[PDB]
Amino acid sequence: KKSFEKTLSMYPIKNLEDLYDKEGYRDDQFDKNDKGTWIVNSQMAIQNKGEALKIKGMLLKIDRNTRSAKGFYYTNEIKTEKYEVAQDNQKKYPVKMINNKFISTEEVKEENIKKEIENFKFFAQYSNFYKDGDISSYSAQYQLTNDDYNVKQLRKRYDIPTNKAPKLLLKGTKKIEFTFLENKNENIYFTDSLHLEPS
Protein backbone atom coordinates (compact mmCIF):
# COMPACT_ATOMS: atom_id res chain seq x y z
CA LYS A 1 0.00 0.00 0.00
CA LYS A 2 2.14 2.86 1.29
CA SER A 3 4.61 1.72 -1.36
CA PHE A 4 2.07 3.59 -3.53
CA GLU A 5 1.75 6.58 -1.20
CA LYS A 6 5.33 7.61 -2.06
CA THR A 7 3.96 8.56 -5.50
CA LEU A 8 0.23 9.13 -5.04
CA SER A 9 0.82 11.63 -2.20
CA MET A 10 2.15 14.00 -4.88
CA TYR A 11 -1.22 14.11 -6.66
CA PRO A 12 -2.48 16.43 -7.92
CA ILE A 13 0.42 17.74 -9.99
CA LYS A 14 -1.45 20.44 -11.94
CA ASN A 15 1.67 21.59 -13.72
CA LEU A 16 3.36 18.43 -15.02
CA GLU A 17 6.50 20.54 -15.65
CA ASP A 18 7.10 20.26 -11.90
CA LEU A 19 8.29 16.72 -12.70
CA TYR A 20 11.43 18.24 -14.19
CA ASP A 21 12.44 19.00 -10.62
CA LYS A 22 10.94 15.95 -8.94
CA GLU A 23 13.46 13.27 -8.09
CA GLY A 24 12.42 9.63 -8.32
CA TYR A 25 13.99 6.29 -7.37
CA ARG A 26 17.27 5.87 -9.22
CA ASP A 27 19.17 2.57 -9.27
CA ASP A 28 22.41 1.20 -10.72
CA GLN A 29 20.72 0.84 -14.12
CA PHE A 30 20.60 4.65 -14.11
CA ASP A 31 23.86 6.24 -15.22
CA LYS A 32 25.25 8.71 -12.66
CA ASN A 33 24.68 11.61 -15.07
CA ASP A 34 21.10 10.65 -15.97
CA LYS A 35 18.46 12.38 -13.80
CA GLY A 36 15.84 10.09 -15.35
CA THR A 37 12.75 10.40 -17.54
CA TRP A 38 9.22 10.41 -16.04
CA ILE A 39 6.96 8.26 -18.24
CA VAL A 40 3.36 9.27 -17.59
CA ASN A 41 0.47 7.43 -19.22
CA SER A 42 -3.30 7.88 -18.75
CA GLN A 43 -5.84 5.88 -20.74
CA MET A 44 -9.59 5.35 -20.93
CA ALA A 45 -10.93 2.14 -22.49
CA ILE A 46 -14.67 1.86 -23.10
CA GLN A 47 -16.65 -1.01 -24.59
CA ASN A 48 -20.32 -0.37 -25.37
CA LYS A 49 -22.52 -3.50 -25.68
CA GLY A 50 -21.96 -5.29 -28.97
CA GLU A 51 -19.28 -2.74 -29.90
CA ALA A 52 -15.47 -2.82 -29.97
CA LEU A 53 -13.28 -1.74 -27.05
CA LYS A 54 -12.46 1.92 -27.68
CA ILE A 55 -9.26 3.29 -26.23
CA LYS A 56 -8.02 6.89 -25.91
CA GLY A 57 -5.01 8.05 -23.97
CA MET A 58 -1.72 9.91 -24.02
CA LEU A 59 1.83 8.81 -23.29
CA LEU A 60 4.39 11.45 -22.30
CA LYS A 61 8.14 11.14 -21.66
CA ILE A 62 9.34 13.90 -19.35
CA ASP A 63 13.12 14.03 -19.75
CA ARG A 64 14.67 15.57 -16.60
CA ASN A 65 18.02 16.04 -18.34
CA THR A 66 16.78 18.22 -21.23
CA ARG A 67 13.81 19.83 -19.43
CA SER A 68 11.71 18.80 -22.46
CA ALA A 69 8.80 16.34 -22.86
CA LYS A 70 7.62 14.40 -25.92
CA GLY A 71 5.14 11.62 -26.52
CA PHE A 72 1.86 11.03 -28.32
CA TYR A 73 -1.89 10.99 -28.11
CA TYR A 74 -3.38 7.66 -29.22
CA THR A 75 -6.70 6.02 -30.10
CA ASN A 76 -7.40 2.37 -30.77
CA GLU A 77 -10.27 -0.03 -31.33
CA ILE A 78 -10.17 -3.67 -30.19
CA LYS A 79 -12.94 -6.02 -31.31
CA THR A 80 -11.91 -9.58 -30.45
CA GLU A 81 -10.69 -11.39 -27.36
CA LYS A 82 -7.69 -12.84 -29.26
CA TYR A 83 -5.09 -11.24 -31.57
CA GLU A 84 -6.29 -10.26 -35.04
CA VAL A 85 -3.70 -8.41 -37.16
CA ALA A 86 -6.21 -6.75 -39.52
CA GLN A 87 -7.68 -4.61 -36.71
CA ASP A 88 -5.00 -2.02 -37.61
CA ASN A 89 -6.87 0.70 -35.74
CA GLN A 90 -4.01 2.17 -33.72
CA LYS A 91 -3.44 5.83 -34.49
CA LYS A 92 -0.72 7.92 -32.84
CA TYR A 93 -0.53 11.74 -32.81
CA PRO A 94 2.91 13.01 -31.70
CA VAL A 95 2.89 15.84 -29.15
CA LYS A 96 5.37 17.87 -27.07
CA MET A 97 4.75 19.49 -23.72
CA ILE A 98 5.19 23.25 -23.88
CA ASN A 99 3.93 25.46 -21.00
CA ASN A 100 1.93 22.60 -19.38
CA LYS A 101 -0.09 22.24 -22.59
CA PHE A 102 0.13 19.43 -25.10
CA ILE A 103 0.94 20.61 -28.63
CA SER A 104 0.72 18.56 -31.83
CA THR A 105 4.11 18.57 -33.53
CA GLU A 106 2.37 17.46 -36.73
CA GLU A 107 -0.76 18.23 -38.72
CA VAL A 108 -3.94 16.88 -37.18
CA LYS A 109 -6.81 17.11 -39.71
CA GLU A 110 -9.66 15.65 -37.60
CA GLU A 111 -11.11 18.51 -35.53
CA ASN A 112 -12.27 15.98 -32.90
CA ILE A 113 -8.68 14.81 -32.21
CA LYS A 114 -7.41 18.42 -32.03
CA LYS A 115 -9.91 19.20 -29.28
CA GLU A 116 -9.08 16.05 -27.26
CA ILE A 117 -5.36 16.92 -27.31
CA GLU A 118 -6.06 20.59 -26.41
CA ASN A 119 -8.20 19.65 -23.37
CA PHE A 120 -6.33 16.50 -22.27
CA LYS A 121 -5.26 16.09 -18.65
CA PHE A 122 -3.29 13.20 -17.23
CA PHE A 123 -4.82 11.52 -14.17
CA ALA A 124 -1.95 12.91 -12.05
CA GLN A 125 -3.10 16.48 -12.81
CA TYR A 126 -6.60 16.26 -11.33
CA SER A 127 -6.73 13.33 -8.87
CA ASN A 128 -6.12 13.21 -5.11
CA PHE A 129 -5.18 10.33 -2.77
CA TYR A 130 -9.17 -5.63 0.88
CA LYS A 131 -8.52 -8.33 -1.77
CA ASP A 132 -4.71 -8.64 -1.85
CA GLY A 133 -2.58 -10.61 -4.31
CA ASP A 134 1.13 -11.31 -3.73
CA ILE A 135 2.96 -13.62 -6.12
CA SER A 136 6.71 -13.06 -5.92
CA SER A 137 4.27 -8.89 -8.40
CA TYR A 138 1.87 -7.55 -5.75
CA SER A 139 -1.60 -6.00 -6.01
CA ALA A 140 -4.35 -4.59 -3.81
CA GLN A 141 -7.89 -4.13 -5.10
CA TYR A 142 -10.64 -2.06 -3.44
CA GLN A 143 -14.39 -1.62 -4.01
CA LEU A 144 -15.06 2.13 -4.30
CA THR A 145 -18.30 4.18 -4.26
CA ASN A 146 -19.40 6.82 -6.75
CA ASP A 147 -18.67 9.56 -4.22
CA ASP A 148 -14.97 8.74 -4.23
CA TYR A 149 -13.26 11.97 -5.34
CA ASN A 150 -11.37 10.25 -8.15
CA VAL A 151 -14.42 8.37 -9.43
CA LYS A 152 -16.24 11.70 -9.70
CA GLN A 153 -13.24 13.16 -11.49
CA LEU A 154 -13.38 10.38 -14.06
CA ARG A 155 -17.13 10.81 -14.62
CA LYS A 156 -16.67 14.54 -15.35
CA ARG A 157 -13.88 14.11 -17.90
CA TYR A 158 -15.13 10.95 -19.54
CA ASP A 159 -18.48 9.61 -20.70
CA ILE A 160 -18.76 6.40 -18.69
CA PRO A 161 -21.73 4.28 -19.98
CA THR A 162 -22.28 2.39 -16.72
CA ASN A 163 -23.27 3.63 -13.29
CA LYS A 164 -21.59 0.79 -11.41
CA ALA A 165 -18.93 1.92 -8.91
CA PRO A 166 -15.48 0.85 -10.07
CA LYS A 167 -12.83 -1.22 -8.36
CA LEU A 168 -9.45 0.43 -7.95
CA LEU A 169 -6.50 -1.90 -8.55
CA LEU A 170 -3.09 -0.93 -7.25
CA LYS A 171 -0.88 -3.22 -9.34
CA GLY A 172 2.87 -3.27 -8.72
CA THR A 173 6.05 -5.08 -9.73
CA LYS A 174 3.49 1.48 -10.08
CA LYS A 175 0.27 1.17 -12.12
CA ILE A 176 -3.36 1.87 -11.19
CA GLU A 177 -6.70 0.82 -12.73
CA PHE A 178 -10.34 1.79 -12.23
CA THR A 179 -12.38 -1.17 -13.53
CA PHE A 180 -16.01 -0.10 -14.02
CA LEU A 181 -17.17 -3.12 -15.99
CA GLU A 182 -15.45 -6.44 -16.69
CA ASN A 183 -18.01 -8.59 -18.45
CA LYS A 184 -17.26 -10.75 -21.48
CA ASN A 185 -16.69 -8.41 -24.43
CA GLU A 186 -18.04 -5.57 -22.31
CA ASN A 187 -15.09 -3.86 -20.67
CA ILE A 188 -14.74 -0.38 -19.16
CA TYR A 189 -11.50 0.54 -17.42
CA PHE A 190 -9.27 3.55 -16.82
CA THR A 191 -5.54 3.16 -16.23
CA ASP A 192 -2.73 5.49 -15.21
CA SER A 193 0.93 5.15 -14.40
CA LEU A 194 3.88 7.36 -13.49
CA HIS A 195 7.42 6.00 -13.05
CA LEU A 196 10.99 7.22 -13.45
CA GLU A 197 13.12 5.24 -15.91
CA PRO A 198 16.57 5.64 -17.57
CA SER A 199 16.76 8.06 -20.51
Side-chain angles (χ1 to χ4, degrees):
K1 183 131 91 167
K2 309 301 186 163
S3 157
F4 264 87
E5 187 200 53
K6 310 209 303 182
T7 291
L8 275 22
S9 47
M10 303 196 287
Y11 301 174
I13 309 182
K14 295 163 171 298
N15 182 21
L16 277 183
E17 292 181 341
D18 295 350
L19 285 166
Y20 289 144
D21 297 323
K22 292 266 200 289
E23 198 132 327
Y25 194 19
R26 295 181 61 253
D27 315 305
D28 315 288
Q29 57 269 27
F30 290 79
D31 176 54
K32 58 201 177 63
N33 293 120
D34 176 34
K35 303 176 201 154
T37 292
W38 292 100
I39 311 293
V40 47
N41 179 211
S42 303
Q43 178 193 286
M44 178 63 72
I46 289 176
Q47 192 171 23
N48 288 280
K49 295 175 189 202
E51 300 198 357
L53 180 64
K54 295 173 171 167
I55 290 159
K56 278 173 192 177
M58 188 181 283
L59 178 100
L60 193 65
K61 311 189 156 207
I62 295 160
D63 185 312
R64 301 194 55 221
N65 300 306
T66 54
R67 297 189 75 94
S68 64
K70 303 180 171 189
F72 56 86
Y73 189 67
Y74 64 94
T75 72
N76 202 14
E77 294 191 1
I78 297 181
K79 184 67 192 200
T80 33
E81 323 199 337
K82 300 187 164 180
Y83 193 81
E84 286 198 3
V85 62
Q87 298 180 10
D88 184 22
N89 298 121
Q90 170 145 46
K91 281 113 172 189
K92 302 172 49 175
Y93 304 86
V95 300
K96 257 173 164 50
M97 182 175 60
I98 293 188
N99 297 325
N100 195 44
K101 282 295 156 195
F102 311 115
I103 303 295
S104 294
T105 58
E106 304 289 347
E107 272 287 64
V108 177
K109 295 179 189 180
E110 305 75 33
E111 192 71 7
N112 50 290
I113 287 282
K114 277 198 162 91
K115 193 161 172 292
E116 288 164 22
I117 294 169
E118 189 166 25
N119 306 329
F120 186 84
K121 291 292 189 200
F122 282 91
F123 186 75
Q125 292 174 271
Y126 59 78
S127 63
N128 185 292
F129 280 108
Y130 312 76
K131 296 182 174 178
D132 302 23
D134 186 330
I135 300 86
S136 41
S137 152
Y138 61 91
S139 72
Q141 181 178 111
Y142 303 86
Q143 181 58 60
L144 310 179
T145 82
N146 290 312
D147 295 294
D148 196 18
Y149 178 93
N150 293 321
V151 181
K152 278 133 81 188
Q153 284 293 315
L154 296 170
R155 296 199 191 271
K156 280 178 185 162
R157 310 175 178 277
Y158 296 106
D159 229 285
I160 308 196
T162 183
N163 56 19
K164 297 158 192 178
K167 306 184 194 170
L168 164 55
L169 176 77
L170 309 180
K171 208 182 74 182
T173 90
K174 187 64 177 52
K175 186 193 179 191
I176 86 181
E177 173 188 336
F178 295 74
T179 309
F180 297 81
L181 207 56
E182 204 172 61
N183 308 328
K184 201 182 66 180
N185 301 294
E186 192 182 355
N187 301 262
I188 306 169
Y189 59 93
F190 181 84
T191 70
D192 176 80
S193 61
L194 173 71
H195 71 271
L196 186 80
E197 80 174 9
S199 319

